[PDB]
A paper describes a structure:
Here, we determined the X-ray crystal structure of the binding domain of BoNT/E, a toxin of clinical interest, in complex with its [name] oligosaccharide receptor. Crystals containing HC/E in complex with the [name] carbohydrate were produced in space group P21, which diffracted to a resolution of 2.2 Å, with two HC/E molecules per asymmetric unit. The [name]-oligosaccharide fully occupied the receptor-binding pocket of both HC/E monomers, however weak electron density around the non-interacting Neu6Ac6 and Glc moieties means that they could not be included in the model accurately. The receptor-bound structure of HC/E reveals an overall ganglioside binding mechanism similar to other BoNTs with a central role for the conserved ganglioside binding site (GBS). Three of the five carbohydrate moieties within the [name] polysaccharide: N-acetylneuraminic acid [Neu6Ac5], galactose [Gal4], and N-acetylglucosamine [GalNAc3], interact directly with the GBS. More importantly, a significant conformational change is observed for loop 1228–1237 likely triggered by its direct interaction with the sialic acid head group (Neu6Ac5) of [name]. In particular, R1230 seems to take an important role in this loop movement, as its side chain repositions itself so that the guanidino group makes electrostatic interaction with Neu6Ac5, thus pushing the main chain and rest of the loop further away from the ganglioside. This interaction is also stabilized by water-mediated bridges with residues S1235 and G1237. Gal4 interacts with the central SxWY motif by a hydrogen bond with S1222, and is held in position by aromatic interactions with Y1225 and stacking against the indole ring of W1224.
The botulinum neurotoxins (BoNT) are among the most toxic molecules known to man and are responsible for botulism, a rare but potentially fatal paralytic disease. The binding (HC) and translocation domains (HN) combined to form the heavy chain (HC) which is linked by a single disulphide bridge to the light chain (LC) following cleavage of the toxin into its active di-chain form. BoNT/E recognises neurons via a dual receptor mechanism that involves binding of the HC domain to cell-surface gangliosides and the synaptic vesicle glycoprotein 2 (SV2). Ganglioside binding is common to all clostridial neurotoxins and consists of a pocket in the HC domain that holds a conserved SxWY motif.
Author numbering:
A (entry chain BBB), B (entry chain AAA): 849 to 1252
Write the structure that this text describes.
């Protein structure tokens, strides 16, 4: 375990599942993601806060004891102009009237951790991810934050399992944190919201191996992710990003094939995300028990989004003596006796075209300028890297990311 | 073998070893590193140039043929004041009077690649490493740069084998590079020098695999590296950095043990490097090569520098029940029948204390606030990370990095 606080959703509210049974209360309007109620949004244009009343005996008051904090945060930039201001605002507050304890704050494209003792001596850690230069891994995406505190060593800041910033806290004396942890946007100039999920406190300094274990497990790997790090959904319009060609987008040709030799236009240095064809994912075998979540090894149809309500199947043209099979839009609504098997490697999604007789056509990818299904990828994967042409992200249009 | 230009040192000059017999001319005062002549230094306070007259065959003049550039660069910041100006200056120029071709340029903590066609259309790739926040892997260090160009897709900038920037060059037409590659610091507003080594042009778009191979193999993998990325040397004074404890330095206690609970002071956010004890390395038995280069599996003595005259052996105190053996300074010059076996994982150095009888005492490391030899590390290594207590860098005091 090591966890002395596990914030999780149960029975239309948030509860502590660590065993220390800390009390969690919602005040005002707190958004719950319908598809993952572990995820909550907080606003600053209303009353909107989560207050954890910590178990009296977990409340950190010490000079020597090690502790760690982990959570995921989602920071929308909207138009990217509203956020472009040098001002620091608190999102998670665990500091007493003494100003002893810790807090998580934000700035323009920045996450900040502050730890301060009873004497007003502090240490601050920062991650500055900056503006989207091509494709951003951070803006409007779930970001896994982990702060580990060694009282005889340094405080270390991790982002998505990677060590970013570490500074000595050997100078820090007795730290007494607030009885309350307040999830609220305080002193933000503009109106916005922030996403929080899987907030944890641990009674030790986590090592890299334990941090990477939390990073992969907490999201639930069995369910595929969209671009933003949310659960991939059936019956939902998505743009396509090829992870090996982040500057390219998919367009329809007149012969009903798909081109990938289209360059994304830039807003400053940021690639446009809402470019090229939109697709919807559909279950092969429907039911009532079935939710809208896309899981590993689910058999689906990839539907091209046409003029309006109209949806045409994507299929691999197998009538060729060349190994790569051209992807075509079926005008007739014929599936050509094919299914697509969904799978993933982290946030990268794969689409394996198979005939209904169970034979492999190949993974969705590209050959020169054309989108194809190819078996080449099975034996030519590049390990522990996003530079594989069979890796795709699904981008849903959202108010959090504006290209208006 | 896709190399069409390979700049290496032979017979008191630089020559093309690719076999395409391009000419390399040294004009004026160009510094050659005595320990690695393949590395050269370029000044802007006087005449300092390397000029490659490319063989007419290798001169790039095409709109479809893929190509890659690779080289290491070393950029000192001195006392981090004179370099703090927004001023883009050229270091490598392959631009025709047409302003067609490519060039490498620098700004404050920045490396820039520019590619331009005959019609003035250009694309720029940038790497901004910024100021030292604790420890910098970039400032006054050998940085491996790799640019690959797909005329049907992206130009890609790699730093130390990692993809940093990629942008479409698909809209670029005929590119005609100049006949000459000029290594010279041009339009830098301040006086400085720049290190270069292992310049290559390739006649294809290298993949991540080939870039990773050049990164590890170009500098001799059998020779250990100092903090800057130069070869580690015998009979040379070094400060110590523990890689797991970058904010800490090693001092001597009055009892002759070594403390690691000493915190580096900062200039802005940059840790001091010239703190704590000085060590020198000495061969147990002299080398047949006639070198001062520290190699993998070399048996050495590590000597504490009390003063320039007075050197004292480091030994592991084996007169204890503890598994970890406290490192001590031998006042009497007694080495207690021990040697140190040097090895490396990339730029990380390991020091294995052993008895002359062949028994292992343990890798140099720490247990809480005390430097130790410990066999624990043998069976408790974390793979694919610098987060190991038995990983060390050796910092030589140099004018390129000032802390004054
Ligand atoms: C946790 C620890 O002390 N590990 C020792 C190891 O201890 C053994 C068991 O693992 C202990 O549980 C047990 O505890 C008993 C006490 O000894 C006893 O007094 C008490 O009465 O009862 C306890 C419960 O029974 O003791 C046994 C003894 O065998 O013993 C080994 C030797 O075999 C090591 O000493 C080990 O400590 C590690 O020592 C190495 C050097 O040998 C090194 O100093 C380690 O320190 C680092 C590291 O390099 O990995 C330093 C890092 O900063 C630190 N943190 C991070 C984030 O990396 C890591 C830790 O691994 C991390 O804090 C937790 O994963 O340690 C040092 O840990």
């Amino acid at each position: 375990s090591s966890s002395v606080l596990n914030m999780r959703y149960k029975n239309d509210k948030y509860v502590d599942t660590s065993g220390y049974d800390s009390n969690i209360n919602i005040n005002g309007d707190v958004y719950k993601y319908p598809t993952n109620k572990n995820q909550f949004g907080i606003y600053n244009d209303k009353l909107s806060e989560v207050n954890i009343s910590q178990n009296d005996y977990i409340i950190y008051d010490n000079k020597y004891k090690n502790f760690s904090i982990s959570f995921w945060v989602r920071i929308p930039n909207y138009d990217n102009k509203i956020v472009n201001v040098n001002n620091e605002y608190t999102i998670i507050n665990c500091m007493r009237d003494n100003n002893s304890g810790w807090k998580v704050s934000l700035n323009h494209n920045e996450i900040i951790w502050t730890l301060q003792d009873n004497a007003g001596i502090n240490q601050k850690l920062a991650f500055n991810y900056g503006n989207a230069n091509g494709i951003s891994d951070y803006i409007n995406k779930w970001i896994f934050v982990t702060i580990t505190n060694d009282r005889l060593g340094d405080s270390k800041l991790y982002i998505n399992g990677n060590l970013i910033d570490q500074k000595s806290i050997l100078n820090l004396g007795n730290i007494h944190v607030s009885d309350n942890i307040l999830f609220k946007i305080v002193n933000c100039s503009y109106t916005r919201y922030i996403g929080i999920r899987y907030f944890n406190i641990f009674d030790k300094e986590l090592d890299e191996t334990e941090i990477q274990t939390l990073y992969s497990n907490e999201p639930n790997t069995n369910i595929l992710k969209d671009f933003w790090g949310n659960y991939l959904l059936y019956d939902k319009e998505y743009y396509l990003l090829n992870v090996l060609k982040p500057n390219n987008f998919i367009d329809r040709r007149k012969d009903s094939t798909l081109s990938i030799n289209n360059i994304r236009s830039t807003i400053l240095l940021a690639n446009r995300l809402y470019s090229g064809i939109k697709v919807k994912i559909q279950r092969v075998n429907n039911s009532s028990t079935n939710d809208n979540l896309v899981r590993k090894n689910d058999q689906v149809y990839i539907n091209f989004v046409a003029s309006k309500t109209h949806l045409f199947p994507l299929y691999a043209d197998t009538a060729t003596t060349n190994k790569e099979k051209t992807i075509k839009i079926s005008s007739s609504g014929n599936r050509f006796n094919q299914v697509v098997v969904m799978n993933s490697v982290g946030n990268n999604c794969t689409m394996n075209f198979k005939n209904n007789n169970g034979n492999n056509i190949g993974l969705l990818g590209f050959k020169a300028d054309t989108v194809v299904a190819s078996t080449w990828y099975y034996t030519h994967m590049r390990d522990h890297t996003n530079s594989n042409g069979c890796f795709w992200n699904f981008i849903s249009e959202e108010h959090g990311w504006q290209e208006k």
